[PDB]
Structures are given as C-alpha cells and as structure tokens.
DNA sequence: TAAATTTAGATTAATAAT
DNA sequence: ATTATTAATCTAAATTTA
C-alpha cells in the first residue's frame, strides 16, 4: 500500500497542536544502538519514500511541516529509531507568524495579501526583474484604494511562488541570508564567514535543516546520555544537527562530519570554534571515499557512535528540479544508499550480526 | 574566474466541485 | 465518492558582472 502523507503534517505530534502520540511500534531490526536520524523532502516522486523505508528497516517515516516550528513551511520526512515520548522544544521558539517575524512589514504589507506563513525556503530566490515587474504592475493603481482582483491574483501568486516579503512602496523582495538563517533556527551570521559567497550562502541555507524541528525530535536524547554522545554526521552541510544538539545542551564528545563542500566544512569548523566545543571534530569530504574500515577504526578508537544523523541530497527529488528530477537513482540522491552503507557498518559493531 | 543573475515546467498532494 | 482545479516545491545550467 502506498505511503500517504498525514494531513495535518504534525508527525507524531507538534507543539501547541493536538494529536501528540507518545508510543510507537518499531521493527526489531530498527532497534538501536546506534540511534539514527535520516531526513529528506516529503514531496518526492512516487515510490521514493517506500524505497527509503524498505532500506531503513521498514520504519514508517515521520512527516513534519516545520511551519509549526517557525514562520516558513518545510514539509520534510524523517526516519528514525528514537523514542517519541518526553519531547521538548528548544527555547525560545522562532516567531510563528509573518507579522511577528518581520516587524517592519506592517508598513508595506497590503491588506489583500492575507499571508500568515511563508512557503519553503529553497536555494533559488526571486529575481530582481520579478520585484520590478510586481512594482510596475501595482504602480498604476497607487491613487486607487485597492487594485482589482485580477492583478491581485498575479501578484499574490508570484509572492507565494517566490516567497517574497513586502519591503518598499510596491516592493515584494525575496528573503535575505540572515532572515532565512534565523527562520531555519541558526544563530545570526552562522554562515557569514569562511569566504562563503552570498550565492553559496543561499544554496547552503536552502539545503539545510530547520534547527527547531530536528531539536524537538532529538530532545529525547538528553536524559539518555548524561555524559555526551558520539555523532556520525553524514551530509553535514552547515551543521543542522550539530546546532540542534548544541541548543539541546547535549555534549558532543566527538563529531565525524562527512560533507563535500569546503565552505560548508569551514562553516562547521567556525561553529565548532565560536561555541568553544570541548569535544573533537573530524571532517571528511566525499562519503564515497569513506571506507567501511575507516568507520570501524574510528569506532574502535572512540567507542562507537551514539547517533548517526544525516540527510542525503534531495536534488533529484525536489519538484523545483526541472531537468533531472529522476528520483532516488539520480546521480546525487542515490548517495542515500551510501548513508545506508555507513549506517550498516555502525550497526555491525553496536548490535552486530 | 568567482558571484550573481537569469532562464528554464512537471509532479503530485490538497482542496473544491461535481 | 470520481474527478477537475488549485497549489507547493531543500533546483540546473547558461550567461553576464565585475
Ligand atoms: N559525495 C558526497 N559526500 C559527502 N557529502 C556530499 C556528497 N555529495 C553531496 N554532499 C553534501 O550533502 C549535503 C546534503 S544537504 C544537508 C546539509 C544540511 N545543512 C543539514 O544540516 O542537513 C550537501 O551539503 C552536499 O554538499
């Protein structure tokens, strides 16, 4: 039977909403150690999440929209073997509505733009010609109290399609890097250093975790590991899970990071340094060159991996991909199985057989 | 030569309408 | 209920700036 997305997309329960569930039946092959956490986009081509679940011990995915955790939607799926009781959110939560997240937008927001939430944060922002086209479309009716509904359709559909916010007289501009940084739960300028360019900043932010959601999911580890954890971070990026564990005050004794982008690794090393992390950070580039024996040796040296967290590329799954949305076997999304390979190695030592 | 700026629809799920 | 519509969507790549 096909996997059907839950409506509402509250997963096993979100804060301030009904429907919390504290118990879950997990397959025996799914039991830890290690605890593992896999994330990807929910809106994939057909049959993708079924294959991911089949390769991850048949764990039914938890489908969560981060719009219950911040101002911007993020319909993601997470497969894990974590306990689902005693979850708690990191404090303080991000601003929930557009009115609170963008305090100056009052001055420019139109009454007919009835948006309360922003759409998903992607790696492609609206173009300046888009802002100028909306400005030119609405200027003729400046002296009129409200433009007729036929242009309202166009402008509202463009604002939703490109996730624009009102900043000037008739200016609907996309989000700025620090804006999506705060919305995605990262501290200010978390991705500003390391010689990363603005374009690379956008691409890395669009591809990242919403820290509050992942932290709500990972909070159950705090009572389990009083003296810190060993982390295997696959497809680390700008370090979503690391920031989440940092906000959860869960000591990260060791982090083996695997991330091919050098500016991403520099951002992770920066975050490690500016937060004065006591533990050790090890960085790897290509997961395809990470050998099974390297994983086994690292485990023997440090004592296994308490948690294996990652999100393989959603490249060939995202609906925004025009040319190469070929599914799980795409050149980049297929790296998912790489994840599964390293996970098995870890399991081979912690539970064995 | 790195950045930034354009230049490009399709696939499903959700919702409304038979 | 079967199905029309409405809607959301962690992008790729070819130019052009600077
Ligand atoms: N072959 C490979 N080996 C290691 N990492 C890879 C890879 N191919 C792609 N990646 C990386 O995998 C990442 C997935 S995006 C996940 C990062 C996000 N900040 C998060 O916290 O989850 C991308 O940053 C991409 O650069």
Overview of the molecule:
The PDB classes it as transferase/dna. The entry lists the keywords plant DNA methyltransferase, transferase, TRANSFERASE-DNA complex. It forms a trimeric assembly. The entry is titled "Crystal structure of the DRM2-CTA DNA complex". The protein is DNA (cytosine-5)-methyltransferase DRM2. The organism is Arabidopsis thaliana. The strands form two sheets. The protein has a seven-stranded mixed sheet, sandwiched between helices. The relative contact order is 0.14. It starts with 34 loop residues before the first strand and ends with a helix. The protein is globular, with a radius of gyration of 21 Å. The protein folds into two domains: 28-93 and 186-350, 3-Layer(aba) Sandwich (Rossmann fold); 98-183, no CATH class. Helix 7 (211-218) crosses helix 8 (240-247). Strand 7 (252-258), helix 9 and strand 8 (280-284) form a beta-alpha-beta unit. 31% of the residues lie in helices and 12% in strands. It has 353 residues and is α/β, with parallel strands linked by helices. The chain contains eleven helices and nine strands. Bound molecules: S-adenosyl-L-homocysteine (SAH). Residues 207-209, 235, 237-238, 240-241, 258-261, 264, 286-288, 311, 313, 335 line the site of S-adenosyl-L-homocysteine. The structure holds a DNA duplex (18 and 18 nucleotides).
């Amino acid at each position: 039977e096909p996997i059907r997305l839950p409506n509402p997309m509250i997963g096993f329960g979100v804060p301030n909403e009904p429907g919390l569930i504290t118990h879950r039946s997990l397959p025996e092959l799914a039991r830890g150690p290690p605890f593992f956490y896999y994330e990807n986009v929910a809106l994939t081509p057909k049959g993708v999440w079924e294959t991911i679940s089949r390769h991850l011990f048949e764990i039914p995915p938890e489908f969560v929209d981060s719009k219950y955790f911040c101002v911007a939607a993020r319909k993601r799926g997470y497969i894990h073997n974590l306990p689902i009781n005693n979850r708690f959110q990191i404090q303080p939560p991000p601003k929930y509505t557009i009115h609170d997240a963008f305090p100056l937008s009052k001055r420019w927001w139109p009454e007919w733009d009835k948006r309360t939430k922003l759409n998903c944060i992607l790696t492609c922002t609206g173009s300046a010609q888009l802002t100028n086209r909306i400005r030119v479309a609405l200027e003729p009716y400046n002296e009129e109290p409200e433009p007729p509904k036929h242009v309202q359709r166009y402008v509202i559909d463009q604002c939703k399609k490109w996730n624009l916010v009102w900043v000037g007289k008739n200016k609907a501009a996309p989000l700025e890097p620090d804006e999506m940084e705060s919305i995605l739960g990262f501290p200010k300028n978390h991705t500003r250093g390391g010689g990363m360019s603005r374009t690379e900043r956008f691409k890395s932010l669009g591809n990242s975790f919403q820290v509050d959601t992942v932290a709500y999911h990972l909070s159950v580890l705090k009572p389990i590991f009083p003296h810190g954890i060993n982390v295997l971070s696959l497809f680390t990026g700008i370090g979503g899970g690391e920031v989440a564990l940092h906000r959860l005050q869960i000591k990260m004794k060791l982090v083996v990071s695997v991330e091919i982008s050098k500016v991403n690794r520099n951002i992770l090393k920066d975050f490690w340094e500016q937060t004065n992390q006591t533990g050790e950070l090890i960085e790897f580039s290509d997961i395809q060159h990470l050998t099974n024996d390297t994983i086994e040796g690292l485990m023997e040296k440090y004592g296994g991996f308490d948690l294996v967290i990652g999100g393989s590329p959603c490249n060939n799954l995202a609906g925004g991909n025009r040319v190469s949305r070929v599914g799980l076997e795409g050149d980049q999304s297929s790296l998912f199985f790489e994840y599964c390979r390293i996970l098995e190695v870890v399991r081979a030592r912690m539970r064995g057989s």
